[PDB]
Design an enzyme around this catalytic site. Sequence first.
Site, PDB file in Angstrom:
ATOM      1  NE  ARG A  58      -4.077   0.310   1.978  1.00 38.40           N
ATOM      2  CZ  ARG A  58      -5.163   0.954   1.131  1.00 38.40           C
ATOM      3  NH1 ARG A  58      -5.025   1.906   0.716  1.00 38.40           N
ATOM      4  NH2 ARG A  58      -6.134  -0.089   0.933  1.00 38.40           N
ATOM      5  CG  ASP A 113       3.025 -12.497   3.994  1.00 41.73           C
ATOM      6  OD1 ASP A 113       3.854 -11.904   3.455  1.00 41.73           O
ATOM      7  OD2 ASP A 113       3.047 -13.116   5.157  1.00 41.73           O
ATOM      8  CE1 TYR A 114      -2.968 -11.978  -4.193  1.00 41.73           C
ATOM      9  CE2 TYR A 114      -2.776 -14.114  -3.681  1.00 41.73           C
ATOM     10  CZ  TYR A 114      -3.266 -13.256  -4.440  1.00 41.73           C
ATOM     11  OH  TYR A 114      -4.335 -13.549  -5.160  1.00 41.73           O
ATOM     12  CB  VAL A 115      -4.970 -12.971   2.026  1.00 41.09           C
ATOM     13  CG1 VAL A 115      -6.486 -14.038   2.553  1.00 41.09           C
ATOM     14  CG2 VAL A 115      -4.162 -12.658   3.268  1.00 41.09           C
ATOM     15  CG  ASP A 223     -14.827   1.645   2.410  1.00 43.25           C
ATOM     16  OD1 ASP A 223     -15.968   1.530   2.478  1.00 43.25           O
ATOM     17  OD2 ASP A 223     -14.061   1.912   1.431  1.00 43.25           O
ATOM     18  CG  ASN A 228     -13.286  -2.096   1.242  1.00 47.01           C
ATOM     19  OD1 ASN A 228     -12.713  -1.926   0.229  1.00 47.01           O
ATOM     20  ND2 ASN A 228     -13.742  -1.110   1.894  1.00 47.01           N
ATOM     21  CG  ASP A 241     -10.014   0.612   1.883  1.00 41.78           C
ATOM     22  OD1 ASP A 241     -10.749   0.692   0.865  1.00 41.78           O
ATOM     23  OD2 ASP A 241      -9.539   1.338   2.521  1.00 41.78           O
ATOM     24  CD  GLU A 243      -7.322   4.547   1.419  1.00 41.38           C
ATOM     25  OE1 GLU A 243      -8.436   4.354   0.732  1.00 41.38           O
ATOM     26  OE2 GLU A 243      -6.436   4.999   1.174  1.00 41.38           O
TER      27      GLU A 243
HETATM   28 MG   LIG Z   1      -9.974   2.674   0.245  1.00 38.73          MG
HETATM   29 MG   LIG Z   2     -12.248   0.082  -1.050  1.00 37.57          MG
END
Ligand SMILES: [Mg+2]
Ligand SMILES: [Mg+2]
Length: 352
Positions: A58, A113-115, A223, A228, A241, A243
């Site tokens: 990110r 890490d990727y999921v 969010d 998400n 997500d 954020e």
């Molecule tokens: Mg976002």
């Molecule tokens: Mg989003």
Amino acid sequence: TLPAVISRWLSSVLPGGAAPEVTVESGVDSTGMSSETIILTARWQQDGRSIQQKLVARVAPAAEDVPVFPTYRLDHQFEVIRLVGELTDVPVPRVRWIETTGDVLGTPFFLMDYVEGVVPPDVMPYTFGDNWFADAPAERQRQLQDATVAALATLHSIPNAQNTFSFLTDTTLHRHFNWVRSWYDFAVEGIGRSPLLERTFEWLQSHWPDDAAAREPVLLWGDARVGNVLYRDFQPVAVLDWEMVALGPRELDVAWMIFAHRVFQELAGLATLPGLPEVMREDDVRATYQALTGVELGDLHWFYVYSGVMWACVFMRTGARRVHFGEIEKPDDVESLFYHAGLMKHLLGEEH
Ligand SMILES: [Mg+2]
Ligand SMILES: [Mg+2]
Ligand SMILES: [Ca+2]
Ligand SMILES: [Ca+2]
């Protein structure tokens, strides 16, 4: 340069001679716009054999990117995801490295890490049909819904949230409200004013949810919506997500998840599609949440209006980005971009 930088960091953590190579697997969304996160593939050698791992970065956006938000604290995102992983069984990606300085890439970023999993789509909205979630049996859709509300309930049950998450900070709702007002002001700068949203902020101030705002705040995912969350077999395997992560009244996340689906139902209706009217109904969501937490939610009405304002800020930022990229003309009236405007006017005509 992101793959270069991750390759170097890998060179500092793996055995000498691993010789990692990093490439971009996915750096744009399905419309060719830069994505929130970038998926990278890392390959290296270990004991004569190839190892391959996916990683997700990110990266904080730069001004010329037309960022959604006026400020970014990727360090707060990273720490919440870490703590949620530590303190609960809500599935989140394992965090790996945060570069806070921006000295390496130009701007701060973190790696996870990727999921593997699937998400109910934003493009086209999952209410448009032709996707794994919309096409699943009603029973399967309701399993996913209930598991997702259960994840939310778990988040909201972390003890002493204001202390544990103090870096995130009158009341918490008051401070969040001032942040939304600053977000609107930021968005105005790129696209112009909305008389509707200005009257709505006055409404929100004069119909404050005193009781909800006075209660103990919880960690707010922000969010908080199915788009998400990564799923496998209709169960959450990563909540993404963070954020908009915050501290605040629990009603805000629950109202956000319900209203998010209503915005997509509205878009589907504009496309003359029937959508998914049995998904994320308020009655079902409140029953599930309250049965899991034992906590009574305040009336969500104010929080739905408030969610509408925040979605409108998003649309104002999407609008600015699209003009910046020449894709549209700066609209005669910004409210043209708010296809939930009518939803909002009907809410504002109720008395709760
Ligand atoms: Mg976002
Ligand atoms: Mg989003
Ligand atoms: Ca855990
Ligand atoms: Ca009325």
